[model samples]
Target: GSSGSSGLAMPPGNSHGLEVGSLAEVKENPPFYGVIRWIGQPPGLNEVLAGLELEDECAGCTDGTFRGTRYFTCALKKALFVKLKSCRPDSRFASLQPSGPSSG
Candidate 1:
């Protein structure tokens, strides 16, 4: 019995970048640097869960979702999505900072 649900649920079907030579062609987007304001859900089985940038979500879509080891994405409106190839857990943009008002 090949139940559709039984089978591994494929990650989001979207295009985030292109492949050029031996590298994935990614867009030069702004960087996200902020504390993880919220963690809605755990990046389970085929997903990645993490939060960042607390002050203003719009300022930086510091949320991330990773599918497997090659797909990662971020969304501000609700959640972010990036192709498996364009995903990088070790990238500078993936750094997480503390979120809270500075005390003097």
Candidate 2:
């Protein structure tokens, strides 16, 4: 019988635009960049993580709290619930810099 603790996992994906989008979004924001505070993996079968980011965490409440852990010190009202820097693209933008050059 198939069990919950089969130790099997679903592999995440990577698409070009996903990485690029993060770069762009970071630049637009505080630029403090990715900051990891409380991160843990209870299972390889199912992994979980959280990152405390931005001293300037989106121009708001300083910081917030997690279940049992104080994520960003005092409090962080806004924290981007984002992960996997190279996840996948939603829009799949063609270009952002200038023009596309022929890759040959």
Candidate 3:
């Protein structure tokens, strides 16, 4: 018998544009640029993982492979795995604004 978990579980809130195929930048010093290739809960994890294909080659990336599954194609050191919330809109194409309307 092949019984498995139902499906990817999403947190009970908006992901803020952390979706697959979306371009994003990690909030690190100097920042890390990438495209969102995957977003889901990997087995044994409580939070969603955001697989990003970095714009430049990284020496310690996973090359689009995660937990033994290939989600997309990229250089051997260009695939980076980060938490879904860690990603933000690319500054080159995004502007600052309130995400929602206030109830004043």
Candidate 4:
């Protein structure tokens, strides 16, 4: 009899080409906007992490510190860390339509 053991499904490989200094939004329980300050693996983590400087200070955020490493400078409760893939482009800036000659 063959063992019914299906391997775990791997996550999609997509980073959206985000980089440091890039503005992004974190879609969490309570979504917030911020800028990408750091983009890489933490001290002992196996996945890439993103350090964001939230536009508004959040009580659940840090001060640009992760795993005892300072990636950037920010006010207390303003820095947040989340999976690099979780960061998305700011939607506020996505509504600007191009102003080219219209062909109607």
Residue-wise C-alpha lDDT for candidate 3, range 11-33, written one tens digit per residue: 45544456887787788775678
RMSD of 4: 9.5
Clashes of each: 8, 5, 0, 0
lDDT of 3 at 22: 71
Q: Return the candidate ranking by TM-score, descending.
A: 4, 3, 2, 1
Give the TM-score comparing model 2 with the true structure, all chains together: 0.31
Residue pairs that clash (backbone atoms under 3 angstroms), model 3 = none
Q: Summarize candidate 2's per-residue lDDT along 1-104 as a digit string, tens digits.
A: 34665433344433233332233233333344444454433334233344434445466533544434454453355554344442222332335547578574
- Model 1 scores a C-alpha lDDT of 0.34
Weakest ten-residue segment in model 2 by summed lDDT: 19-28
Better candidate number, 2 or 4, judged by lDDT: 4
Runs of candidate 4 exceeding 4 Å displacement:
1-13, 94-104
Residue-level lDDT of model 4, residues 2-64, one tens digit each, is 355643323455445566876888787886788888888866767778888888866777899
Query: CA lDDT of each candidate?
Result: 0.34, 0.40, 0.74, 0.75
Q: Which lDDT tens digits does candidate 1 get at residues 19-52?
A: 2111122223754333322222345544322333
Sorting all predicted structures by lDDT, with the top scorer first, yields 4, 3, 2, 1
- Candidate 2 lDDT (Cα, 0 to 1): 0.40
Alpha-carbon shift of residue 15 in model 3 (angstroms): 4.3
